[PDB]
Subunit: 150 residues, 4 copies
């Protein structure tokens, strides 16, 4: 399913993002002078199951989770540099049941253990000066689709 | 190369759309009550190499070409019905040297012989009440990419 | 549909190879010291609709057609050099109704006007010392499948 | 990279199968009356990193590991039923660092924690009366390739 996720907005998924689900987020640009850029996978109750905070200024990408009216938990990090490939940077999130796999354009995948056992119903995108285009292209699959030879 | 083509606007191509090139246009939605929706492949001099005019009101899809300061040439029509697949209808245009191949979601491919021998430097999208989303996701290839088993 | 086409043998297609059909033939190797290698798309009546003769010794790739008990017609050619990419060379054939599009790994596509208006029921592979592996992987589609970003 | 893995034989990988790697194994057929069919991912020292034992007779699929000159470790079983889709059943193995992801044609992915920390240098295929074709088409990726919209 194709969605157009606009900055400081969200998209309601036709189906729950759950184990086996894949979200292929692609940007039509890379604004090298952009600031903190966030992608959140939300549950129906608006609990932030997966928070992805790309912070060029801090040269790090933070992953976290929190209930709608709860406190952020400990942050998990990975360096920002050499993760995105301009001019079409991307983020791919896959639900593996007990954890999330997040792949950017370079480097190895990041694995984040689920903290809030609930499926996602929407995906949000926030930024005051996004590193990416608005909107970003998002193809969501219920399962890994067939793969081309390369 | 991924581009986001907004309605009543256009995108300048990083490279010339020429033989072997492929443009996969995908809409995040289908607006059943939409009106005439157009897609133009323009050369650097603004000549309309390929005019795709979807007319639900006339229940037809029209193809044509014309120079920047010239009149339209003869029209080529095909049925509008049974072409687009909601909620993510699509259009795929391939340059085969002497002609363009246009594929929709249903039916056999449509072939339009080239009338203006120039490569396209841009793609335009116009509509007062677009049948499709704005923007539309557009992936342009320099050549057919590797194919998945399905 | 996936098939394993062995050298000096053939595969009977589950469905007729016809307009919109795509055959993605891939080899698991490139034997640089191989000789003339042939791929034929046959009709039920065993008429050779498309004959693809790769001749390294003559540095050319010949395309032709002939009825089961008929004579070969005029040959159409294209240089052999810089067409295949080792170690996994490929050939992609697409039926466009009035002609065939044949793409290798490099260079522009080759277009061959149909001479025998009939659909194909089988694909044959012949060679005494094939440039390719035995068998070759062959995925046949009833129509162009969705395309990955690249 | 495309390989053709013949039954009761193996293929040496051009590169190490390691984290991020993906092996898409596809059979050109399904032999309903076939017997126990095995796929092994072996390290350079011939240690069996991942043993995939499909047992229709026991109606189960077994996963295990062992050193070249060692005994088998504890077995992990899953149902055989509702896994493979004829006529072209498939198996997809992805290396996620600390574990392997194994996907068949139906059902959710199976995860097998790594037991031997070595990368695989080869893939073996054994069976007296294989459930699958011989050879099997195998596409090995160094990382997840771009995904088609479907």
């Amino acid at each position: 399913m194709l969605y157009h996720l606009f900055v400081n907005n969200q998209v309601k998924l036709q189906n729950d993002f759950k184990p086996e689900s894949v979200a292929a987020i692609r940007s039509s640009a890379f604004n090298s002078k952009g600031g903190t850029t966030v992608f959140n996978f939300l549950s129906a109750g608006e609990n932030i199951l997966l928070h992805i905070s790309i912070r060029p200024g801090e040269n790090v990408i933070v992953f976290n989770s929190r209930l709608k009216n709860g406190a952020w938990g400990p942050e998990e990090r990975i360096p920002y540099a050499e993760k995105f490939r301009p001019p079409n940077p991307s983020i791919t999130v896959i639900d593996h049941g007990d954890r999330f796999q997040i792949r950017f354009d370079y480097g190895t995948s990041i694995y984040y253990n689920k903290r809030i056992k609930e499926n996602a119903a929407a995906i949000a995108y926030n930024a005051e000066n996004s590193l990416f285009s608005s909107p970003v292209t998002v193809d969501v699959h219920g399962l890994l689709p067939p793969l081309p030879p390369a």
